[PDB]
Write a protein of this length. Sequence first.
Lengths: 167, 167, 167, 324, 324, 324
Amino acid sequence: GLFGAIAGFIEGGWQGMVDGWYGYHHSNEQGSGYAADKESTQKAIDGVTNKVNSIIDKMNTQFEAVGREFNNLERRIENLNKKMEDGFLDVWTYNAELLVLMENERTLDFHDSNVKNLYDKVRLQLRDNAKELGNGCFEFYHKCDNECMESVRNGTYDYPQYSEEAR
Amino acid sequence: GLFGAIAGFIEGGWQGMVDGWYGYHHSNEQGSGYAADKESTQKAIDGVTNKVNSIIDKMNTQFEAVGREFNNLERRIENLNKKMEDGFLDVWTYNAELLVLMENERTLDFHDSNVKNLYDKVRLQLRDNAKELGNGCFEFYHKCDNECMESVRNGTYDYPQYSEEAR
Amino acid sequence: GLFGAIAGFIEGGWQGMVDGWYGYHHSNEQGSGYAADKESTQKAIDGVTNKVNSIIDKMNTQFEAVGREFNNLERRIENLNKKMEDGFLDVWTYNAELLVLMENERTLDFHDSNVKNLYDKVRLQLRDNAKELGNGCFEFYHKCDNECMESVRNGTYDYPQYSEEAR
Amino acid sequence: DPDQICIGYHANNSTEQVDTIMEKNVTVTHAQDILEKKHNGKLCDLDGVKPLILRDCSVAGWLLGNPMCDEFINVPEWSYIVEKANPVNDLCYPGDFNDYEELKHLLSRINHFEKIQIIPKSSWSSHEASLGVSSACPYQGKSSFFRNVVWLIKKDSTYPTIKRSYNNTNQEDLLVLWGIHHPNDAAEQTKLYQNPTTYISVGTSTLNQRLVPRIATRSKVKGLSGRMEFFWTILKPNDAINFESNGNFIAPEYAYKIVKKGDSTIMKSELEYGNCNTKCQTPMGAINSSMPFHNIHPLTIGECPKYVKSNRLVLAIGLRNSPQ
Amino acid sequence: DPDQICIGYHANNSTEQVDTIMEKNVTVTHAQDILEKKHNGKLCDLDGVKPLILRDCSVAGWLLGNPMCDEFINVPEWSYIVEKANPVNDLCYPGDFNDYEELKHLLSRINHFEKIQIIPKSSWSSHEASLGVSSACPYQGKSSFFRNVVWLIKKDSTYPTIKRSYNNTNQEDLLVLWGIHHPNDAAEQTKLYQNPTTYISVGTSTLNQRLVPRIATRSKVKGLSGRMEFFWTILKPNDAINFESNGNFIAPEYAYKIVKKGDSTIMKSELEYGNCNTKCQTPMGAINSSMPFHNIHPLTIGECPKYVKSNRLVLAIGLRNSPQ
Amino acid sequence: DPDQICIGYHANNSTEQVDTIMEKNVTVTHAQDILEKKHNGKLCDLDGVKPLILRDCSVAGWLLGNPMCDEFINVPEWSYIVEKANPVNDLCYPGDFNDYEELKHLLSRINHFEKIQIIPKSSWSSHEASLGVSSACPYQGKSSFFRNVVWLIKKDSTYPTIKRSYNNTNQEDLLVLWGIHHPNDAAEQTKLYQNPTTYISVGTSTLNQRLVPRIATRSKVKGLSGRMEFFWTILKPNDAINFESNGNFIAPEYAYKIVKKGDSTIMKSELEYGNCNTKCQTPMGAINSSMPFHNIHPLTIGECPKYVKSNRLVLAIGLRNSPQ
Ligand SMILES: *[C@@H]1O[C@H](COC2O[C@@H](C)[C@@H](O)[C@@H](O)[C@@H]2O)[C@@H](O[C@@H]2O[C@H](CO)[C@@H](O[C@@H]3O[C@H](CO[C@H]4O[C@H](CO)[C@@H](O)[C@H](O)[C@@H]4O)[C@@H](O)[C@H](O[C@@H]4O[C@H](CO)[C@@H](O)[C@H](O)[C@@H]4O)[C@@H]3O)[C@H](O)[C@H]2NC(C)=O)[C@H](O)[C@H]1NC(C)=O
Ligand SMILES: *[C@@H]1O[C@H](COC2O[C@@H](C)[C@@H](O)[C@@H](O)[C@@H]2O)[C@@H](O[C@@H]2O[C@H](CO)[C@@H](O[C@@H]3O[C@H](CO[C@H]4O[C@H](CO)[C@@H](O)[C@H](O)[C@@H]4O)[C@@H](O)[C@H](O[C@@H]4O[C@H](CO)[C@@H](O)[C@H](O)[C@@H]4O)[C@@H]3O)[C@H](O)[C@H]2NC(C)=O)[C@H](O)[C@H]1NC(C)=O
Ligand SMILES: *[C@@H]1O[C@H](COC2O[C@@H](C)[C@@H](O)[C@@H](O)[C@@H]2O)[C@@H](O[C@@H]2O[C@H](CO)[C@@H](O[C@@H]3O[C@H](CO[C@H]4O[C@H](CO)[C@@H](O)[C@H](O)[C@@H]4O)[C@@H](O)[C@H](O[C@@H]4O[C@H](CO)[C@@H](O)[C@H](O)[C@@H]4O)[C@@H]3O)[C@H](O)[C@H]2NC(C)=O)[C@H](O)[C@H]1NC(C)=O
Ligand SMILES: CC(=O)N[C@@H]1[C@@H](O)[C@H](O[C@@H]2O[C@H](CO[C@]3(C(=O)O)C[C@H](O)[C@@H](NC(C)=O)[C@H]([C@H](O)[C@H](O)CO)O3)[C@H](O)[C@H](O)[C@H]2O)[C@@H](CO)O[C@H]1O
Ligand SMILES: CC(=O)N[C@@H]1[C@@H](O)[C@H](O[C@@H]2O[C@H](CO[C@]3(C(=O)O)C[C@H](O)[C@@H](NC(C)=O)[C@H]([C@H](O)[C@H](O)CO)O3)[C@H](O)[C@H](O)[C@H]2O)[C@@H](CO)O[C@H]1O
Ligand SMILES: CC(=O)N[C@@H]1[C@@H](O)[C@H](O[C@@H]2O[C@H](CO[C@]3(C(=O)O)C[C@H](O)[C@@H](NC(C)=O)[C@H]([C@H](O)[C@H](O)CO)O3)[C@H](O)[C@H](O)[C@H]2O)[C@@H](CO)O[C@H]1O
Ligand SMILES: *[C@@H]1O[C@H](CO)[C@@H](O)[C@H](O)[C@H]1NC(C)=O
Ligand SMILES: *[C@@H]1O[C@H](CO)[C@@H](O)[C@H](O)[C@H]1NC(C)=O
Ligand SMILES: *[C@@H]1O[C@H](CO)[C@@H](O)[C@H](O)[C@H]1NC(C)=O
Ligand SMILES: *[C@@H]1O[C@H](CO)[C@@H](O)[C@H](O)[C@H]1NC(C)=O
Ligand SMILES: *[C@@H]1O[C@H](CO)[C@@H](O)[C@H](O)[C@H]1NC(C)=O
Ligand SMILES: *[C@@H]1O[C@H](CO)[C@@H](O)[C@H](O)[C@H]1NC(C)=O
């Protein structure tokens, strides 16, 4: 996909992360587990929900009464109605089908962007204190216990505290 | 946003940069200030202007005369006109509203891309001679006077000249 | 463009790479040449082909018979048909013209993404064993013969094998 | 073993697929269809005024009081009219209804409707008013006629020239119906009406009509080569309708007070009333939906989604999910 | 302190907001509305030919010369016609205008228009031509009539059969108007025209018409139970119109040379002329705009933006800008 | 010199350009136009039933058998009708065709069509059937008439009242045509038909018609001030048409069995048949295309792309390519 993360350098999704769309998996001497990124997940939910609601709510609906009220010597007028009806059907059918195709592409690429952006936020905190493995994971050059792991997830990782043990 | 820079790792915009859309802020022993990137700004202006003009200019406009010329025993034909008029109103209303929503998303993401691309151009020139702080800024490991700063902005930064003082 | 690679940090295309859309150029003591990335090229071909076919195949086409069957004392009805015909012409003309403009932007940005993603795949394999020049090229700190070059292209580059000679 | 932190995304057991512009059949974690495909299979009120459901009668048979129709039950307002595709009981006595389609359109949606007697059947002192019957219009095994109009014939070999007026003293428009009989030949003409050369003149403040019977050798329809031709007008408050005739006159007895606000149309459907309410009615059932599109039926009445030729419009909500 | 260089973007004092597909109310540095919402409040020329503005007359009253209308001022061309919603002066003598809506459509846009005398009022030697007046059509406190046609009556208890022709020797189509009077009864019929059974035959190379007066007891309208019914045709160059009648004939005196290029329609508006020019006219004012959409009024004449139900269509130009 | 590996993309010698929303005239490596601009310049079969091509005759001249038309060749089915813009041979004897446009629409697409004799020309024993000719309808330098109907006149200074029936014993609907002659004056009336006051009554199970000749002083058209006016009906299987007349009757000899499935329309074109097949026909040629849009002509018959006002719709396929 467009941003290279989902089904890209991050090769697959996690069945084990049940409480959010995007997040983290850690492994250290104390254990391992998944933690959702609450903020990015909620923003994404709001974003996609807004898109769907706009597609729905921007439609202007008005009362119409559609019947067949012309007689056997009014076939030319009845044909005028046919062309109009068929014309609007063709317009709405094409526009609805393409809208769905195009917006589905946008939605999937939006998730991909969201994951890439989360990845990069971590990358720039860790910098030289961890190895970038190329698969979505970072391998620490120092011990990173649970409190350390949480500091990375909450964006307060203290690089100067660990640089010595990393080198 | 999609590219992660605007209101992302670059957390806010600069009131102080008045003469362009994207650019640089420097701080050294000689002082500080803002400089617009002329090239990226102009290309972006041309790009957005073209989009707006296309939305405007691609509309086919033709002469029509819209009145109500059917009588009290021509109500079925008058209803045919109603359905047509209302039908085109619904089509143009939906298409115009969604067009605006969708193109506004594109425009904001385009600016974000433009900023990310400018950032990356600098990043790759500086490489190992500066620290990437994660907030849009680079912290030099050497003195970078005004001429040095201009070399970065004009894309002619000489890495080999400073590598020794940086290490 | 949006992803910064095509006509960006990779300044121009290669006439010399005839057998694919995206790929690699290598230079070593044994010689030089171009190799297409088969996988990314094929996926891109499938992707663009699908888009074109969707634009074509999602159109609903039905039989209609368009003539001028109203007489000299049926001009008000004939005008109703005019407004309808002209109305559908304006709708299809606008939607077709913008569709082409918008999808062309998507297509060009898709190619750009595909190139950026290929670049990044290489970048993350090589890491510290090569210099990132900023122009799409990597300059090895070790000798990389033809077998080594192929390992990079097929995504099996062995970093630990060369790290010592690189340092 | 060194410690690791990884970035990743949600997967689940969903097999739901969507299509994108570049790729078909992409499995995702969650999706949402925006095409309405369901209806309740019933004919309902519309906002929420009941329709007029004519069962096996046409609008004309209902208005004129075709005796083969069900007895007239007062429905003082309705939102749309439902007829069967081919109502069995239309014009029992063969013939025609002038400007019939415009009348049906006018009656499609009505805010007030009330049948009133305007010319008592008993008031025809100089003509025979109880012999205007036909085997074509039976009621209970006996020849009868449209119940709301009167087929007058001669009395004592005399048909005096009729001069009758009705003044609309009501505060509402009045729908008035009358007819002319077209006999088979001159011998029949004089048998029924005495006078060989006849007319029906009808005048209001806007109407200026003079009908004359056309003789033609016509095909027997239900045993009859004769024809009835019906006409109508809207008599405004304080206006008067004036009839004059020396034969062939099918006179009004009852007319209808009407109040007209909006219009709708005539729905063709074989369904019966379903004691429900809706914003959007189709001939095979009502739609209750805020979705933008539907694929049920084109002949809708109400505020409906946009009709499309599609089996599904499925939006991705969640993320790319490995398929099964 | 180490030296720094930073990448960033423009912000300003803008509080302008836009909506995007994923987020509402995004504040940006610059935006542009593409919906036209303004008009000049005036009725203008169209490209730039003046409209025909009928003030308080209908097209029929204007054509026939209803005396209650303003005196005929020659306007030799126009782009569209403006009537008030309910023109007070239409048919002063009650009645009807045949194929009136088609005639109005034909006259909506005209390239040349010129009233000419085709049958002098003074040429009726065998009939009375100066008594065809009515209290329903006053001019200056005295009974009069439509000024462009002549209500002929008997002279010396005689109405000789009229045989009159006009040949279109002009190089332009000619709009010709005539009428028939429908009296109240036979006593009135013979009082005005002597002859009890009358006709009006009208023939051209295409027209083959025979009118007969219909008697009906009609409601008094402006004190009158009589009716006038008007007819028209387009007489081609070198064709002749031939009238024949022995009563009830409302004869032409004046007709109109016309040159027809395009069509437009009849605009209903209460506004007066505003000495302006425009490409797009609405009934509440003209639009001067290159914008793709507008929300002013659906009943437009000209080359207009697309009409939508929207209060704003605002495009982002600049960047996300911190709100206030 | 150190070893290098580089990432890059394809370029070629293409000068093809496209436009994008943000940038015009972008040169790319490969592109594809989705606008159909080509046609074959021929009139073709449609799916694949041949059209009825009338050469220099109108539908009316063809149906009635205008002798100036080409002799009737049986075409038992067709998909659409082609007329020239202005067919030279229409009604040889001047006049009119009632409900002509509806009839043309009905005949636009026909599944079965077969001319049959319904009333032999030889069966008119009491009237003259071989003198109904005119210089306006020549065949081979001699006065003639529409070949499918018969202009009856008096015989031995007598025109007995006609009473004729035809019963549709066929299994298909029957299109029946007749006419009335409108003479110039009473002297001509009695010269042709003896009787001064005449009628034509026509009845079926649905039709109830009575025509009377209108006298008018009309302009000579092709030397003639007389007029023929034609009428038609669809006679259902097992129904009978009954004619009665004492003058002015233009009788049927031939009628047409028809089977009606779909409809199409009348195409106006100056092209001839091209021995081809197509799904989409235009008046200047047929389209064979699966493209979504075309710009050839709006007056198409068939399953066509969407008509647009555009010179090109070019999609990028390949990549940005340096221009020349
Ligand atoms: C349909 O019906 C409308 C109402 O009809 C009715 O009023 C009277 C006539 C009764 O029949 C009653 O039963 C019924 O409800 C009708 O209207 C009436 O039209 C009449 C036409 O002439 C008119 O009659 C005249 O009334 C004059 C008095 O008018 C004043 O007083 C009225 C009562 O208060 C008031 O409504 C008026 O506004 C006004 O102030 C009389 O002086 C007239 O004189 C007589 O004229 C007769 C012949 O016309 C002669 O016989 C007499 O010698 C004398 O000369 C006359 O009676 C009545 O006023 C109208 N009423 C209203 C409310 O308008 C309407 O015309 C009918 N519609 C038709 C036919 O199309
Ligand atoms: C409407 O008007 C058209 C023009 O009318 C006029 O021409 C004449 C008749 C005058 O009335 C004049 O004031 C007016 O402008 C009209 O047309 C004319 O139709 C006439 C019908 O017969 C026709 O008259 C005939 O003309 C013959 C000569 O024709 C030659 O010369 C003409 C003058 O140069 C020329 O225009 C012609 O092209 C041609 O070269 C005569 O020889 C005819 O003979 C006479 O016929 C009379 C009865 O018909 C008898 O009384 C005589 O004994 C003799 O036999 C005859 O006069 C005239 O030529 C037509 N002119 C044109 C330009 O076409 C048109 O018919 C009118 N439209 C209607 C009625 O629908
Ligand atoms: C158009 O044509 C339809 C078919 O016409 C034909 O049938 C007969 C009449 C011949 O003319 C034949 O050449 C032609 O194909 C027509 O229909 C017929 O309408 C007739 C109207 O009366 C009707 O005739 C009656 O038939 C009775 C017998 O009916 C039984 O037998 C028939 C033959 O097997 C069968 O089709 C019927 O279903 C039924 O079982 C007779 O007993 C009737 O009695 C006579 O009535 C006469 C006057 O009406 C008197 O002269 C006699 O004294 C006696 O009283 C009578 O003959 C015939 O049955 C109908 N046939 C069908 C198939 O329906 C149709 O009416 C025509 N359409 C019109 C006019 O609009
Ligand atoms: C009153 C009566 O019975 N008169 C006899 C005629 O009916 C009969 O002619 C036959 O008429 C048949 C149809 O009969 C009715 C009907 O429609 O039912 C009988 C009705 O009473 C009569 N109604 C009135 C108001 O007159 C009605 C009416 O006359 C016609 O419909 C008018 O068009 O006719 C059927 O048409 C038969 O074809 C026909 O023979 C004759 C028998 O010769 O005698 C009459 O006394
Ligand atoms: C000439 C005259 O005054 N004749 C007397 C009749 O007018 C009068 O009948 C009354 O007529 C009233 C309307 O009067 C006019 C009119 O419309 O103004 C008077 C016009 O002069 C007359 N015009 C012509 C050309 O004849 C006109 C015309 O006859 C009718 O409109 C034709 O339908 O009538 C009004 O209708 C009254 O209701 C009516 O009583 C009678 C009185 O008995 O005497 C006539 O001599
Ligand atoms: C039979 C014949 O020749 N009768 C003489 C009239 O024709 C002639 O009047 C002239 O008629 C001219 C047109 O002649 C035809 C025609 O249309 O060709 C001749 C046809 O034979 C005749 N057909 C029939 C069935 O009667 C036809 C028909 O009467 C009319 O079209 C009916 O409207 O007329 C042309 O109109 C001339 O203007 C006219 O003088 C007169 C001469 O006075 O003598 C007749 O004996
Ligand atoms: C899929 O997962 C959901 C959430 O745990 C569960 O409710 C549902 O039953 C699962 N589907 C299966 C087991 O087929
Ligand atoms: C997508 O799915 C449908 C079955 O639901 C199948 O018929 C179609 O061929 C599939 N298309 C592709 C490209 O796999
Ligand atoms: C916002 O900034 C512009 C540009 O300096 C200025 O012209 C405008 O007045 C400012 N708005 C204020 C002060 O409200
Ligand atoms: C956006 O702005 C309008 C006021 O201009 C407000 O009514 C609406 O609720 C806002 N929506 C959101 C989601 O803030
Ligand atoms: C462009 O390149 C193609 C592929 O080699 C070649 O077939 C074509 O002739 C070239 N165009 C020229 C030489 O103008
Ligand atoms: C794009 O190309 C056309 C010629 O094909 C030219 O007329 C037009 O001006 C060009 N536009 C730009 C912006 O270069």
